[PDB]
A paper describes a structure:
Retinoic acid-inducible gene I (RIG-I)-like receptors (RLRs) are cytosolic innate immune sensors that recognize viral double-stranded (ds)RNAs. RLRs (RIG-I, MDA5 and LGP2) are members of the so-called Superfamily II (SF2) helicases/translocases. They share a multi-domain architecture that consists of a central SF2 ATPase domain accompanied by two N-terminal tandem caspase activation and recruitment domains (2CARD, only in RIG-I and MDA5) and a C-terminal regulatory domain (CTD or RD). Simultaneous binding of an RNA ligand and ATP to RIG-I switches the protein into an active state in which the otherwise shielded 2CARD is released. Activated RIG-I homo-tetramerizes via 2CARD and nucleates the polymerisation of its adapter protein, mitochondrial antiviral-signaling (MAVS), to elicit the innate immune signaling cascade.
By contrast, the RIG-I SMS variant C268F shows the opposite effect and is constitutively active, although this mutation is only two amino acids away from K270A in the same ATP phosphate-binding ‘P-loop’ in motif I. In order to elucidate the molecular basis of autoimmune signaling by RIG-I C268F, we went on to crystalize RIG-I Δ2CARD C268F in the presence of a 14mer dsRNA and ADP·BeFx or ATP and determined the corresponding structures. Crystal 1 had space group P212121 and diffracted to 3.3 Å, crystal 2 had space group P6522 and diffracted until 2.9 Å. We did not detect any density for a bound nucleotide in either structure. Intriguingly, despite an overall high structural similarity to wtRIG-I Δ2CARD bound to dsRNA, the SMS mutant shows crucial amino acid side chain rearrangements in the active site that stabilize the protein in an activated state but prevent binding and co-crystalization of a nucleotide. In particular, the bulky F268 side chain displaces the evolutionary invariant motif I K270 from its central ATP phosphate-binding position in the P-loop, into a position where the Nε of K270 is situated at a site normally occupied by the Mg2+ ion. As a result, K270 now forms a salt bridge with E702 from the C-terminal RecA-like domain 2A, which in turn occupies the ATP γ-phosphate binding site. The resulting overall conformation resembles the ATP-bound state of RIG-I, but without ATP, and could thus explain how C268F is able to signal independently of any nucleotide. Unlike wild type RIG-I, which requires both RNA and ATP bound in order to be activated for downstream signaling, RIG-I C268F can signal independently of ATP in the presence of RNA. Slight intramolecular rearrangements within the RIG-I C268F ATP-binding pocket appear to compensate for ATP binding and render the protein active in the presence of dsRNA only.
Author numbering: 239 to 493, 501 to 663, 690 to 922
RNA sequence: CGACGCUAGCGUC
RNA sequence: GACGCUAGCGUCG
């Protein structure tokens, strides 16, 4: 152990080194990696000569996986332990069984292990002696962590009595979920402890003073401000809205309406979702009326978003956003509909710009953020900032404004989504891999949970780091208020736990956990009857025939193909700007409607073992029926019931 | 393609 | 006290 550990690290690691299933709960940045390494070195120094240990470490983000894989193999080969890892890119056509056998420390994404557990390639978890979940707080509803633990609990409660592994979770906090007093919070923490069969929660108690000189708590600030006094854009855009919806009335004629909400977008998603069953006797003019109206609603949706961007940013940015929109749809073909909508746009456009570009009109949010930045960089010209927005439209809007606003010449921004002065960002899953210490973080119209709150403090470990929350909605302020109270209750409940006898707590967890077992068994739902009939699937933006269900076979129960040239008729392949690959496929194209003026996104095109195939999404089509004539929309594939004819290579 | 998590809004016993 | 739907965001096979 020659790299100088601190006493709070040994204090956290101690119970794990005593063999107890343990949840380490410590502030982001305490150095969990050293704790994991110490625990592992100890775990497998323990064994006699005739037995050997096998450790598995789960990370569920690739950078963390690669980082841990690297540091584990560097620390452990000197001691004689084969280290290896498996992730999505390295998973296929390799006999995972003997990879696991042949190696003593094993770093995994969790999905690969549930996938191997279910296909029996991995018989039981009794293969492992120690399991380590990094960011274990999402050992919760459907997350792969929980599916692994379900397998563990099954072996626990069933008569099958193989030796089970020791389970350690690491986290900066446990969450309380939707808990509103200390006893509810207590219950939720006990439920999560049960999910990982933990007997101990390790926090820092004796060496608090050492810890609080390592990771400091940044000071928080709330900036309540109010929305735009004057809405010129909103007047004229509203008028555009009710024009387009009068067009809806001209063909649809069928119905609390607020223009600019998430009310409004859910309503418009509903008008599309209800209008893809417009069934006439004529089929030609019905295809084109229904798509007149799909287009009207798509344009109304991207009309609405423009004004939410107006509320949260400049209006020159929203303007550039929908000028990009119209350049986008210009290349999708030209009908009467395109020229018509776009031409009423042209009419408004110039008064529109004249509205946008006048200093008269500034979102007070933007000038308050300019204020904050000016102050922090006047007092510290070397401040490194990070700014969290909600939509990824807002990220490049704010960036363009930073460069375009001259007050902040001294800012040189950089992005990250899914050198520098300041980073603009949406959300980063869970604490994350190494990042430059930021000493200023700002949350711009930000809402979140308690765990994200604890974790965001790790950007500003150093003393004198600062964090701002600025908003036009007292809602958001109150919503982080309740979060801080939730952190209070979490700490209070954890300490109330540690003052219980071990055994009372362990029989508590055992009973919680047999409960939840028979719950998930009861909740196991049986099949309905799959119906065996010839169903037509038509497009969603042209409603033209695509194929029937007897055309489609299914591949490993998830992705569904088509056979026969009847599909090669009605799409066009487009080589893709993101040639990703996932488990046993390679992605090369996205396929769209070959129909003139349609070009809707229908699926992708991909190499599977020796074949090229396109594979498609339901929630990009409509499903009719021969005798009924009626048609119905499905979103999720698993939601759709018919004869599941598996893919045969024999054709 | 598909599986999950977080958030907001809205519903069901 | 959970489930579902719509969307935003993130991750992963
Ligand atoms: Mg996740
Ligand atoms: Zn189409």
């Amino acid at each position: 152990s020659p790299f100088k550990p601190r006493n709070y690290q040994l204090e956290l690691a101690l119970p794990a080194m005593k063999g107890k299933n343990t949840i380490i709960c410590a502030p982001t940045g305490f150095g969990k990696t050293f704790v994991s390494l110490l625990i592992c070195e100890h775990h497998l120094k323990k064994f006699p000569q005739g037995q050997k240990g096998k450790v598995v470490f789960f990370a569920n983000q690739i950078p963390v996986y690669e980082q841990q894989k690297s540091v584990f193999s560097k620390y452990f080969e000197r001691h004689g332990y084969r280290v290896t890892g498996i992730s999505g890119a390295t998973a296929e056509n390799v006999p995972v069984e003997q990879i696991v056998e042949n190696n003593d420390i094993i770093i995994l994404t969790p999905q690969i292990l549930v996938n191997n557990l279910k296909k029996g390639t991995i018989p039981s978890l009794s293969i492992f002696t120690l399991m380590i979940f990094d960011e274990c707080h999402n050992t919760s509803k459907q997350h792969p962590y929980n599916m692994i633990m379900f397998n563990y609990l099954d072996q626990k409660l069933g008569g099958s009595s193989g030796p089970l592994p020791q389970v350690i979770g690491l986290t900066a906090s446990v969450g309380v979920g939707d808990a509103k007093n200390t006893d509810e919070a207590l219950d939720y923490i006990c439920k999560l402890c049960a999910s990982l069969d933990a007997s101990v929660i390790a926090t820092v108690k004796h060496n608090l003073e050492e810890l609080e000189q390592v990771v400091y708590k940044p000071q928080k600030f709330f900036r309540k401000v109010e929305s735009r006094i004057s809405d010129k854009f909103k007047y004229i855009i509203a008028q555009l809205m009710r024009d387009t919806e009068s067009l809806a009335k001209r063909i649809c004629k069928d119905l609390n309406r607020e223009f600019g909400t998430q009310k409004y977008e859910q309503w418009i998603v509903t008008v599309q979702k209800a209008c893809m069953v417009f069934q006439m006797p004529d089929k030609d003019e019905e295809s084109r009326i229904c798509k007149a109206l799909f287009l009207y609603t798509s344009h109304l949706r991207k009309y609405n978003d423009a004004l939410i961007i107006s509320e949260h940013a400049r209006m020159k940015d929203a303007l550039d956003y929908l000028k990009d929109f119209f350049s986008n749809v210009r290349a999708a073909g030209f009908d009467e509909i395109e020229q018509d909508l776009t031409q009423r746009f042209e009419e408004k456009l110039q008064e529109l710009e004249s509205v946008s570009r006048d200093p008269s009109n500034e979102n007070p949010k933007l000038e308050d953020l300019c204020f904050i930045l000016q102050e922090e960089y006047h007092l510290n010209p070397e401040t490194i900032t990070i700014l969290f927005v909600k939509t990824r439209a807002l990220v490049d809007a704010l960036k363009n404004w930073i460069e375009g606003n001259p007050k902040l010449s001294f800012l040189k921004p950089g992005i990250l989504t899914g050198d520098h002065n300041i980073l603009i960002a949406t959300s980063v899953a869970d604490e994350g891999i190494d990042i430059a210490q930021c000493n200023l973080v700002i949350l711009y119209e930000y809402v979140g949970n308690v765990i994200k709150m604890i974790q965001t403090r790790g950007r500003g470990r150093a003393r004198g780091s600062k964090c701002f929350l600025l908003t036009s909605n007292a809602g958001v302020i109150e919503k982080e208020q309740i979060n801080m109270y939730k952190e209070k209750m979490m700490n209070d409940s954890i300490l109330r736990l540690q003052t219980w006898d071990e055994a009372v707590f362990r029989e508590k967890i055992l009973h919680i956990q047999t409960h939840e077992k028979f719950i998930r068994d009861s909740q196991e739902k049986p099949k309905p009857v799959p119906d065996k009939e010839n169903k037509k699937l038509l497009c969603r933006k042209c409603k033209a025939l695509a194929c029937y269900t007897a055309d489609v076979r299914v591949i490993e129960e998830c992705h569904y193909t088509v056979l026969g040239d009847a599909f090669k008729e009605c799409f066009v392949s487009r080589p893709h700007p993101k040639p990703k690959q996932f488990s046993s496929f390679e992605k090369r194209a996205k396929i769209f409607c070959a129909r003139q003026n349609c070009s809707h996104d229908w699926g992708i095109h991909v190499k599977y073992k020796t074949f090229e195939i396109p594979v498609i999404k339901i929630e990009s089509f409509v499903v009719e029926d021969i005798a009924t004539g009626v048609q119905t929309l499905y979103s999720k594939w698993k939601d759709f019931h018919f004869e599941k004819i598996p893919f045969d290579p024999a054709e």
